[PDB]
Amino acid sequence: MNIQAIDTRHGTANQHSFSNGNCLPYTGVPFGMNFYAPQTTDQKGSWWFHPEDRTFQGYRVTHQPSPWMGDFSHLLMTPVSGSLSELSLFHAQSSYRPEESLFSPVEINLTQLRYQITSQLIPSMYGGILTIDYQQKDNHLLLTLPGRYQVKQLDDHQVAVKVINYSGCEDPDFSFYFVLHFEQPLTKWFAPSSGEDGKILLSFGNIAQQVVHFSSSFISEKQAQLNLAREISLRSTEMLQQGIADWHNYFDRLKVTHENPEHTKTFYHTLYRTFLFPQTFYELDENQQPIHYDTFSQTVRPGVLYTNNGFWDTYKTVYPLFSLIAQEKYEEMLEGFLNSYNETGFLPKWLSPDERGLMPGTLIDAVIADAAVKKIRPDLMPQFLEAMKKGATQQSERENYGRQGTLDYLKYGYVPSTYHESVNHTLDYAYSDFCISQVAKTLNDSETATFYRQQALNYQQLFNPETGFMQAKDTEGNFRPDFLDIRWGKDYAEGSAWQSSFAVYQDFAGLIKLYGSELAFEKKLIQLCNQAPNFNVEGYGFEIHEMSEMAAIDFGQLAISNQPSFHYPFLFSYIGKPEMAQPLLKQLMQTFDASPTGYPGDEDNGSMSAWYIFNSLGFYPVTPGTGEYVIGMPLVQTAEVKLSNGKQLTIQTSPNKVQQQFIHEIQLNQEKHTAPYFTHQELLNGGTLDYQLGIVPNPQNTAERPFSLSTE
Numbered sequence: 086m087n088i089q090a091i092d093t094r095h096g097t098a099n100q101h102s103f104s105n106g107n108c109l110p111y112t113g114v115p116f117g118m119n120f121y122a123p124q125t126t127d128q129k130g131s132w133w134f135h136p137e138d139r140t141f142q143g144y145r146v147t148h149q150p151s152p153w154m155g156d157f158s159h160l161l162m163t164p165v166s167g168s169l170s171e172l173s174l175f176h177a178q179s180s181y182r183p184e185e186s187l188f189s190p191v192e193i194n195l196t197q198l199r200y201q202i203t204s205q206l207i208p209s210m211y212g213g214i215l216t217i218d219y220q221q222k223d224n225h226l227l228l229t230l231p232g233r234y235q236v237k238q239l240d241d242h243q244v245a246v247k248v249i250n251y252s253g254c255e256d257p258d259f260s261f262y263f264v265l266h267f268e269q270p271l272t273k274w275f276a277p278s279s280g281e282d283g284k285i286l287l288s289f290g291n292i293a294q295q296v297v298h299f300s301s302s303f304i305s306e307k308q309a310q311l312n313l314a315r316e317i318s319l320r321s322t323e324m325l326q327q328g329i330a331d332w333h334n335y336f337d338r339l340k341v342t343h344e345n346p347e348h349t350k351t352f353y354h355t356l357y358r359t360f361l362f363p364q365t366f367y368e369l370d371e372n373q374q375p376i377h378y379d380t381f382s383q384t385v386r387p388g389v390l391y392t393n394n395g396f397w398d399t400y401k402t403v404y405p406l407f408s409l410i411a412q413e414k415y416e417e418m419l420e421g422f423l424n425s426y427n428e429t430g431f432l433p434k435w436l437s438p439d440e441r442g443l444m445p446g447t448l449i450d451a452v453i454a455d456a457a458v459k460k461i462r463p464d465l466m467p468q469f470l471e472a473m474k475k476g477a478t479q480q481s482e483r484e485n486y487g488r489q490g491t492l493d494y495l496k497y498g499y500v501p502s503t504y505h506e507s508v509n510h511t512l513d514y515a516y517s518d519f520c521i522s523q524v525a526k527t528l529n530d531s532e533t534a535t536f537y538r539q540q541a542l543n544y545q546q547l548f549n550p551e552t553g554f555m556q557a558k559d560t561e562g563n564f565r566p567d568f569l570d571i572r573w574g575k576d577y578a579e580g581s582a583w584q585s586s587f588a589v590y591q592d593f594a595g596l597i598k599l600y601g602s603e604l605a606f607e608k609k610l611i612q613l614c615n616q617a618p619n620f621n622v623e624g625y626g627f628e629i630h631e632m633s634e635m636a637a638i639d640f641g642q643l644a645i646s647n648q649p650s651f652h653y654p655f656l657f658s659y660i661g662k663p664e665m666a667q668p669l670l671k672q673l674m675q676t677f678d679a680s681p682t683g684y685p686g687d688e689d690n691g692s693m694s695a696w697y698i699f700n701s702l703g704f705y706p707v708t709p710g711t712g713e714y715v716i717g718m719p720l721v722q723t724a725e726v727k728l729s730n731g732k733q734l735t736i737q738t739s740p741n742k743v744q745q746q747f748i749h750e751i752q753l754n755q756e757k758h759t760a761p762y763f764t765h766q767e768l769l770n771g772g773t774l775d776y777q778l779g780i781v782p783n784p785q786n787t788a789e790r791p792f793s794l795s796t797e
């Protein structure tokens with residue numbers, strides 16, 4: 086699909102109480118350092134855009150990855166004509182018509198009805214161009230500068246701004262520089278000033294059109310001017326063409342068709358949202374070398390850095406996808422993450438712009454392990470192993486970094502029930518341990534490998550044979566009494582025991598053994614899927630959106646609206662019965678579309694989009710760190726995959742209509758494939774993957790299973 090046909094309002098109809106993606110309409114280039122979105126309201130906190138709002142407050146320069154994290158280093162540009170009562174966003178707002186506007190990744194175009202202004206914003210990596218067509222005779226641009234700001238006029242065509250605003254940051258004076266060059270000169274000059282929450286009305290007189298070239302920096306005003314200088318001569322049309330070419334660079338790597346063109350539309354909307362995050366967080370100095378801002382020591386340093394990523398979300402799907410089709414990006418991102426470690430002492434958990442510390446676990450370990458076993462950045466692996474071992478053995482004194490309860494985990498073999506969400510912490514630590522072991526193995530560090538492989542079995546500590554669930558345990562080794570399977574919160578993050586008890590990616594065969602047999606585990610999975618989506622709120626004391634999103638649909642406890650349940654259909658592969666979940670997977674894929682309500686829950690920076698992409702192709706990374714993709718059920722009819730190693734995988738399916746709900750047979754390069762997973766190595770060979778599909782199952786009864794520690 087052409088990038089210009091993507092509508093960025095996809096996934097944008099949301100509120101605090103209910104998510105259909107919690108996406109913003111981000112205009113930007115792939116991994117752009119800034120994104121751009123219309124703001125429709127300032128009265129709803131982080132929910133500052135809604136596609137049904139008919140009010141326009143301004144173009145917002147944003148770094149907001151999610152409404153839960155908030156923004157950093159934002160400002161707004163609002164074209165205005167005539168004179169203003171006061172300069173607040175409310176006093177300057179205009180209505181506009183959503184249905185007459187353009188919202189695409191490479192272009193916003195809209196008319197402010199109050200002022201008779203049509204404007205067009207085209208992005209670039211570090212800046213963009215705003216063209217403003219005025220019908221009236223006294224024409225301006227209002228800059229809204231939240232937080233502490235400075236502004237000065239460099240000359241009659243140029244204004245430099247600095248703003249300090251964020252939701253959380255290690256640098257209390259975290260600065261963003263923004264420079265605007267105007268084709269038509271300012272007709273009122275101003276002196277340097279600074280303050281808080283600035284509103285600066287720039288005047289241009291009676292011109293018919295203004296063209297604003299803008300750029301930005303986290304380094305300095307001078308770096309912002311250098312960023313600008315490198316594109317100051319582009320016309321808007323040329324910048325648009327480059328932006329389209331930038332997106333096509335990624336889109337061309339996955340050319341797919343479907344029986345139903347609505348599915349193709351959905352695919353490409355999710356693909357747009359797969360190449361946004363993590364955002365570029367470095368610039369190119371005068372010698373074209375990477376530099377970035379280090380918020381921890383408050384200094385400019387050489388090297389790459391990336392931001393806006395919670396690994397708890399993104400390790401599941403985003404990086405494994407990059408491992409196939411965007412390895413050059415993966416390579417540079419890993420370098421950035423190592424720089425984060427060098428600068429702060431711990432591998433990052435949630436960058437926005439720096440360590441925010443949210444969510445259980447250190448799932449960056451899975452991003453690293455997956456890269457290691459796939460031979461991505463083998464040169465960095467010795468340093469990563471040291472960083473991971475530090476995270477597993479030292480308690481940070483700063484509460485946002487590393488594992489919480491590191492020492493208790495080592496003392497007891499689990500995080501005890503005195504900690505919040507101790508089940509998630511324990512299971513995440515045990516999986517991390519596995520990831521450390523894998524990195525060690527790739528480096529032939531046998532002693533490390535052995536120790537961490539053993540640690541990775543710590544999930545067994547929280548398994549209660551009485552209930553068949555993971556439960557929190559006190560320091561004397563007793564399970565909390567009064568357990569209820571559907572009770573959310575307290576011991577579990579954003580779920581009940583049903584959404585938390587299967588986070589054992591490293592060792593499903595071992596988890597199965599705790600239930601007693603494959604059959605006992607099968608019965609648990611059937612019960613998970615085939616019950617009503619009941620929930621109890623006692624761990625929170627009220628209903629949260631994740632509960633509502635599960636209860637909005639009839640898919641049992643399989644809460645596809647949130648990351649913990651993403652792998653659930655694949656659990657049937659671990660008992661050799663993937664045919665049981667093939668219809669399920671096709672059904673789950675129908676909960677996604679390209680509309681404002683198009684996702685089942687929070688999209689989370691590529692996380693849910695990449696779930697959709699993998700499942701569309703028919704395979705899924707259940708265990709980052711093994712180099713395997715467990716086979717599911719494809720939605721495409723054809724796909725050409727441009728792999729990073731220069732080869733091509735062609736996927737072809739027999740007719741793939743609504744009634745096709747099973748895999749009949751798979752041939753990889755003309756050889757019958759019966760294993761319930763592919764290896765990364767197999768797929769990287771390229772060639773042809775043919776799925777013959779069925780209207781009834783064709784059980785293979787394979788003795789093969791995807792990777793588990795206890796059977797390797």
Ligand SMILES: [Ca+2]
Nearest residue numbers: 647648687689
């Ligand atoms: Ca989520």
Ligand SMILES: [K+]
Nearest residue numbers: 105682684685
């Ligand atoms: K939805």
